[PDB]
């Protein structure tokens with residue numbers, strides 16, 4: 692429960708989110724997460740690279756935008772986007788209960804950029820370019 696605990700101490704202000712991997716909870720941050728404020732480890736960098744823009748037969752992305760996994764997910768209704776966010780990531784990073792309330796424009800498409808501890812990066816489009 693490493694990611695849960697690290698996020699718990701972000702909220703308690705004992706830790707900076709930029710110092711944790713927001714995907715897996717590794718403290719071995721190698722990089723800035725290109726979409727959201729928070730760190731990312733190398734293993735998750737490779738996951739992101741490998742999983743990015745893989746699609747399921749439903750026409751929505753196969754893997755959660757934050758963690759690269761997920762079963763039950765929220766799916767973006769912006770057809771230029773088609774991203775998914777798993778319910779566990781949403782409840783962890785936005786806050787408890789936030790997944791079932793969301794159940795839609797996703798966190799990348801919404802007007803607001805801040806949702807709980809989840810904060811969209813202003814230069815995200817050009818960060819992905821750098822990332823890839």
Ligand SMILES: [Zn+2]
Nearest residue numbers: 712715732735
């Ligand atoms: Zn990681």
Ligand SMILES: [Zn+2]
Nearest residue numbers: 755758777780
């Ligand atoms: Zn996830």
Ligand SMILES: [Zn+2]
Nearest residue numbers: 767772797800
């Ligand atoms: Zn979207």
